[PDB]
Design a protein around this nucleic acid. Structure first.
Ligand SMILES: Nc1ccn([C@H]2C[C@H](O)[C@@H](COP(=O)(O)NP(=O)(O)OP(=O)(O)O)O2)c(=O)n1
Ligand SMILES: [Mg+2]
Ligand SMILES: [Mg+2]
Ligand code: NA
Ligand code: NA
Length: 327
DNA sequence: CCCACGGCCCATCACC
DNA sequence: GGTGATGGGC
DNA sequence: GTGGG
């Protein structure tokens, strides 16, 4: 559906969702509003009343009332008021800095720190991640055109094979679903010597090499299985520099890999829909495995999975191209 | 009336 | 020094 | 906030 169908309503709900997460610290209300926004966004008609909306699953009494007020006035008094509130709107804004959550934003605003400028003035109170988030605030809210993702993929797959030609690397996420732009880059990594029944160097080696060729520029977090950091394409000398980008690299056991690829190729909406169907034939699927639910819900042993397809087979669904896993 | 609300790794805090 | 809890991200 | 035991 076109966004201008009910965009006014969904904008309202998303903004409400944001204030619940960031200011009220009510995560389940945040998800409630999002779910409501999502189901309304998929609704193929212009909503004329809150009662009409209430028919949709996830839209209840309170949101129905909010829709009525919005339809009658073009606004929400509560939303209008919290927008004007310096404290609440500053708290809500600072959470856009990667590394600053509802709690940190709260503490900052409590002690007079409300803007990016104030953050820049008080580096002493920021942790490593927050400093990076601050330094690349602008860049991190930029999307990544597919053409750059391709170039980023070229570098990653090249350098990974250079380190060890037995590595397997896959760019997942919205890129693998064929999106024409992405928020970040997700890389899944495996190696024939790393399975469930098993360096910590395997992830480190790759990260280090990507640093050596000046692709990776910063590190947010780095463990033995998960890396989160910043990367940047090289410039053309004449041409102006590319924005810095967020990149995640996950090292996964060889025998948990194609569950990982499925999960982290995702679409959140597809994952939960494929979750949904999986439990209905008595299967539970997470990022690691697919397990048969038992006569009680006895989730037993992981089944063998050597491809994305096997997982589709288990729950009698035909293989869906990542291109179509929007939902 | 009352509880659940897809999950987990890493950095850092709280506390012994 | 350490273990467990919490914040944050995705 | 919504849904359901
Ligand atoms: N908590 C999480 C985090 C990620 N995922 C899955 C679904 C996502 O499509 C996939 C990758 O996560 P993601 O990077 O945050 N989203 P994605 O790459 O699809 O789109 P972008 O907004 O980054 O362009 O992992 C998930 O199912 N639950
Ligand atoms: Mg992504
Ligand atoms: Mg990601
Ligand atoms: Na409803
Ligand atoms: Na943030």
């Amino acid at each position: 559906p076109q966004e201008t169908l009910n965009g006014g309503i969904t904008d309202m709900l998303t903004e409400l969702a944001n204030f619940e997460k960031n200011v009220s610290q009510a995560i389940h209300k945040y998800n409630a509003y999002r779910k409501a926004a999502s189901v309304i966004a998929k609704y193929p008609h212009k909503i004329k009343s809150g009662a009409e909306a209430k028919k949709l699953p996830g839209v209840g009494t309170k949101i129905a009332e909010k829709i009525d007020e919005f339809l009658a006035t073009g606004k929400l008094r509560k939303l209008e008021k919290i927008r004007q509130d310096d404290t609440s709107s500053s708290i809500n804004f600072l959470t856009r800095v990667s590394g600053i959550g509802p709690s940190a934003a709260r503490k900052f605003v409590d002690e007079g720190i409300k803007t990016l400028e104030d953050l820049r003035k008080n580096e002493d109170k920021l942790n490593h991640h927050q400093r990076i988030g601050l330094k690349y605030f602008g860049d991190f809210e930029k999307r990544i055109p597919r053409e750059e993702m391709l170039q980023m993929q070229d570098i990653v797959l090249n350098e990974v094979k250079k380190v060890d030609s037995e590595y397997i690397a896959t760019v997942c996420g919205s890129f693998r679903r064929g999106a024409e732009s992405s928020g970040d880059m997700d890389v899944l990594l495996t190696h024939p010597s790393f399975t469930s029944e098993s360096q910590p160097k395997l992830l480190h080696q790759v990260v280090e090499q990507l640093q050596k060729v000046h692709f990776i520029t910063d590190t947010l977090s780095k463990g033995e299985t998960k890396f989160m950091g910043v990367c940047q394409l090289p410039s053309k000398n004449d041409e102006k520099e590319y924005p810095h980008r967020r990149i995640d690299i996950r090292l996964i056991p060889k025998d948990q890999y194609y569950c990982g690829v499925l999960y982290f190729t995702g679409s959140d909406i597809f994952n939960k829909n494929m979750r949904a169907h999986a439990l209905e034939k008595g299967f539970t699927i997470n990022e690691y495995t697919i397990r048969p639910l038992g006569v009680t819900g006895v989730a037993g042993e992981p089944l063998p999975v050597d491809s994305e397809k096997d997982i589709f087979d288990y729950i009698q669904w035909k293989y869906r191209e990542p291109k179509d896993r929007s939902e």
